[PDB]
Design a protein around this nucleic acid. Sequence first.
DNA 1: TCGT
DNA 2: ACAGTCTGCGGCGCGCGGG
DNA 3: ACGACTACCCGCGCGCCGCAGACTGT
Length: 1011
Amino acid sequence: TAEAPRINPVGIQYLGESLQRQVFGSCGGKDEVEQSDKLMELSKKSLKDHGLWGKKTLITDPISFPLPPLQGRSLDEHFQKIGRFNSEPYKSFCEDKFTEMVARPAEWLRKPGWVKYVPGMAPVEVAYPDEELVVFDVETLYNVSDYPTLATALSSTAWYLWCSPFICGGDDPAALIPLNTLNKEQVVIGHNVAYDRARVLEEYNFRDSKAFFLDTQSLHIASFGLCSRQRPMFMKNNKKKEAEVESEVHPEISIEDYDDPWLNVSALNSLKDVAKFHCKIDLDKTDRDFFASTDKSTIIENFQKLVNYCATDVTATSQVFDKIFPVFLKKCPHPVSFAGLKSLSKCILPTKLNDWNDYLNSSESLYQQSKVQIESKIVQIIKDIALLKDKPDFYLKDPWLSQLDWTTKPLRLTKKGVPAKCQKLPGFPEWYRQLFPSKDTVEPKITIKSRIIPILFKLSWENSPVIWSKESGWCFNVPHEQVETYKAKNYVLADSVSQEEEEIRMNNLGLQCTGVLFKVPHPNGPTFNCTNLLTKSYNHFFEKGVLKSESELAHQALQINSSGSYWMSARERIQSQFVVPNCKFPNEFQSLSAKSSLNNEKTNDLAIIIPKIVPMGTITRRAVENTWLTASNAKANRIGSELKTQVKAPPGYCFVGADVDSEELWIASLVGDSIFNVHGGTAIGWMCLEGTKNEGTDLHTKTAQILGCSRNEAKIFNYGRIYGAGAKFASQLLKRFNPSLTDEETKKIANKLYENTKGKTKRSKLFKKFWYGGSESILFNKLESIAEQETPKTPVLGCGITYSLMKKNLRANSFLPSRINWAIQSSGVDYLHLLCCSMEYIIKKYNLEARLCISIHDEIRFLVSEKDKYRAAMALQISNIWTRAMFCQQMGINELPQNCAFFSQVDIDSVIRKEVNMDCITPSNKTAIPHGEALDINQLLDKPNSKLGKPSLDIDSKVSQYAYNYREPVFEEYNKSYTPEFLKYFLAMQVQSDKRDVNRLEDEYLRECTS
DNA sequence: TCGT
DNA sequence: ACAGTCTGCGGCGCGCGGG
DNA sequence: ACGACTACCCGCGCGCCGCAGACTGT
Ligand SMILES: Nc1ncnc2c1ncn2[C@H]1C[C@H](O)[C@@H](COP(=O)(O)OP(=O)(O)OP(=O)(O)O)O1
Ligand SMILES: [Mg+2]
């Protein structure tokens, strides 16, 4: 009765019959039986060498439930037609855009609202432009308020100017620009357009908008890349332009052009630099200071110049767009990319005003209260020290105070006149003078990060007072007899020059000299020096008695350093968010659901924050936002870590979300498995697909149990090993995870693990350099081989790479690792775009009340009404199985494993936090938050309201109109270069685990090709 | 960019 | 009205922490 | 000079070196 599981030759379970019918339709293989037998023999040899043949795997009853039908014979056609469907009007508006520009009025009128100027006709007053495509710019007086002051727009036929009532007689600075974005489909082009979108009146709606704001900076970063490799390549750029500024004549063609061509193919983010690069345009920037004033009357004069400045910026932005925009179509030609960009260009953050203000006060008060007391106490200690000038015996006798300079400043006295030499602290020690920077300073300014802090607070390392040496930082003296014993402790000997300086200065003080100076260990490396001792990395040294201090303040100070540090980094930006309340604008905050359905309270407090998001701010086309993509998670000790819990949902709504599992490891394993055309052909893939996270049998969890470490540290250790990190750094990582270990044990574990993982290396003439004998050698060779292609393209979609990192622009400097990492990191972005496109299609088709709320990398959250919540969760589970199979079919495999098909957990909550069961108690927050719900596939399928409902007939008919063009996968194009016998002999050499066998195979191959 |  | 002689300011690099 | 490196973003605080600017001294 029950269906029998389906298993491939390896012990891996495939999907059930129904899902196989609905996702892959009808397909067949077995094209090369003999070659498949050979590849199976090699895979069996490797698996038996690594000892995974016959091991039990997880078997589960097949899942079967109905799915929405596809719109094509294959997945590529379906995704092409959906991607063409999601942006029909916008792309057609982006093309046919005007090139000629109309003239500008000789004079401008100061009138409140929107004024339209047409050449040859009188100016008119309009409510709002009624134009499909405009170029737009905003200017605001940031010192006075956050609301805008004036705005300028250009179209194909006319000019438009918007003026605020504040500069027209009124005294209320609160006003937003109206553009009617809820009714008319339109495209607004700008540079850093996220700043402008926050100043539009009709973007503060829960109901979805019909406008698309496009940014040129993302188009510049994506193609014609900034060359931001975060490498000396970025630094060598400013030095070259500094040299060009120095000498007017620049004969760079002799050396700089030859070794580094890439210096002439890119520029910076800024509009002046981008314009200068693409076009010969110079943009003077001297009138921005006028907007830094605190008087509105200065705005009233010079009005014509400011409006002409804004118009010049608009014209420059338009000409920059006209150059950059066609290139992005060449680099990124698949329709899904543009739709995903449009989907990520819209985000909204609901919140409450009074709670935000209370959180902002409670996060600053404790920080200032903690800081003030400790600074006052250390000032008091300095004052107590600074009266020992008269008596020489105590500052000479004391070991710690001898280090400080005690020389009195020279005094210059003029005869019959005042000295007037700007003398600071006459008759005072040098260090106390160095405390005061200027004559005006009456009170010393000191921080726990000061260098003199280990001199003020006396500190002993192994019962030895710390000494300062200019070359070796902090050192501790060791007696002559016990030196060999310290050699057992692996303490390094300090530089001989520092030894001579120490003995010379001591002989100047007296008592001759005894012992030898040993450097304090530094966590990053043995050779690296140490400059601070109150950091986090020394905290365990404070316990166990290795580092000791008589004062109890030091034990306080480290905790203070723990408590406020993140706030010290983030206090400004959090206090600079633009929050708009409901009371000021009472005709704007409309509900997502068309039916009001009551849900109105007794004047409740709702507010909205529009994030400033650059969609492609990275050379791997990832999003960059300064504040909400860097927010910390909640912790018991840290102050202000409850930031993401301020986002809340209005009454009658909730949040539904999910996170991807092992995203970059599953993609890396699939690339390796594509040679054998079977899931599990490599050992790393078999280990990755053995278990599931819900049972606790995932690879990251297994790594942690072997190393005795948490799961996050295991993830760091694995992702460091996949990219190029040596065993020496892995040993230091193991020392960092467990401090109470010796170096030799860590070296043995790291060397053994690296020998079992990577294997050995062989250099040959015909085959350049390769790895062999390891469980992951195939992946390491494959990543390099794809990274040395002349034209590198993303496998799933086909996006290109920036001109800065191409091989033809590189001759001496290589910049190799980023080229390897780039393919996988871009594939993650393609994965996110595919899920966003599928979700948009399903929400439009089945008429759900939902919109995208936030999207951190690999995480998506949606705002959903109470009625349809489980349906929204269902809309997630359909999407992922669509995306993952899309990954498999492009690489040749027409099968998908059952265990990896669905999300492990789907979250339903009222606020944003990592886990639904977290109390989220911080020093600033003393109230627990009620828990939410998490679900899996079976529990979701047991709910009665999960089913979607009846579809709409119009959507399919609209989708069917578009066209589909067949394309060839990129890896099939890569395979054409290699002759077939090369692949067979090369893979046979890779599977061997001995030098003699590899040499014999090379001899056989050379004899065969020779004759 | 630095090691040997 | 020229020629030494100190005494602050300003920019830059590097550690150090969050994702 | 041939090999050897975790990758991508965002910011703050402190010490060091290169110059303007006033004071004598003729
Ligand atoms: N230290 C790192 N070095 C390199 N890549 C990293 C590092 N940390 C994270 N990544 C990558 C791997 C993922 O694609 C992404 C972060 O996703 P994340 O959720 O942290 O991990 P994951 O998806 O592999 O595991 P999980 O099962 O916990 O979701 O960025
Ligand atoms: Mg994940």
